[PDB]
Design a protein around this nucleic acid. Structure first.
Ligand SMILES: C[S@@+](CC[C@H](N)C(=O)[O-])C[C@H]1O[C@@H](n2cnc3c(N)ncnc32)[C@H](O)[C@@H]1O
Length: 245
DNA sequence: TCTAAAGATCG
DNA sequence: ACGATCTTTAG
């Protein structure tokens, strides 16, 4: 069981076993909401199509892939005891937001993810990262996870685009796994998008393309994924919607 | 999920 | 320039 090098919400590590158990077999795996890519790191497809709306995220993934050794050596320099304090953090955060170099931003991005408050990723309407200092004892530099990501990424393509466009890339030999932002328990992921995602899923399964969707087990998710074989996992339970052709 | 301060929106 | 009400910001 492999871990990602990034702290990221929606890490489905406790549910990885349940996901792989319902995930159909295929040649290519498509992930419209790849995030930390825990599913990508713990499956075994011959090729992957990985996408996310976060441009900083996708940019990092490309750099780690194409320029692995150069990146690891550069990013490791920021994981020294001297950098674990507020003043250094807020200057590095300011350097990230003012940098126009993809490589430097990707290097600082890992630092901010490991030293930032609760590993959050928050922006303002200007696209500026504004997560405060995290105050951890000693942040772990995920060197092993980085190299393992780069190796598996050799069979993956990273795109920065909405789910509708990424799911449009899926063909006959493709399996689509969707891990959308959690449905509410009653710039966010609106209810209309939640419903639209299920609609696109029904379109793919009508074209003989397998689609698996994970989400909370609420009334809305039941109504959204009504045309799928629902599976309940595990307060609020977890739901798996399988669209089998 | 929290909040004080600053900006946005309308008639 | 007013003022109530959100909206945004960032620790
Ligand atoms: C809940 S996270 C899941 C991450 C991933 N499953 C993991 O293991 O880390 C959902 C991700 O989808 C991305 N996302 C949000 N809205 C999107 C949209 N409208 N289209 C495509 N991706 C989106 C977000 O950037 C977020 O990282």
């Amino acid at each position: 069981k492999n871990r990602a090098f990034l702290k990221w919400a929606g890490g489905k590590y406790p549910l990885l076993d349940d996901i792989k158990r319902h995930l159909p077999k295929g040649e290519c795996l498509v992930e419209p909401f790849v995030g930390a890519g825990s599913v990508f790191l713990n499956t075994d497809f011959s090729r992957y199509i990985l996408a996310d709306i976060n441009s900083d995220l996708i940019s990092l993934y490309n750099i780690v892939k194409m320029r692995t050794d150069e990146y690891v050596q550069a990013a490791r320099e920021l994981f020294v005891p001297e950098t674990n304090c507020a003043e250094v953090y807020y200057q590095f955060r300011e350097e990230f937001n003012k940098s126009q170099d993809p490589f430097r931003r990707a290097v600082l991005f890992l630092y901010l993810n490991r030293y930032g408050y609760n590993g959050l990723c928050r922006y303002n309407l200007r696209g500026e990262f504004n997560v405060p200092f995290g105050r951890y004892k000693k942040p772990y530099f995920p060197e092993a996870e980085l190299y393992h990501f780069a190796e598996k990424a050799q069979n993956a393509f990273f795109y920065c685009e909405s789910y509708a466009d990424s799911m449009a890339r899926a063909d006959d030999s493709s399996v689509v796994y969707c891990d959308p932002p959690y449905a509410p328990l009653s710039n966010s992921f609106t209810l209309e998008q939640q419903a639209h995602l299920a609609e696109i899923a029904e379109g793919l399964v009508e074209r003989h393309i397998p689609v698996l969707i994970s989400n909370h087990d609420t009334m809305l998710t039941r109504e959204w994924y009504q045309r799928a074989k629902l599976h309940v996992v595990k307060k609020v339970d977890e739901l798996l919607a399988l669209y089998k052709p």
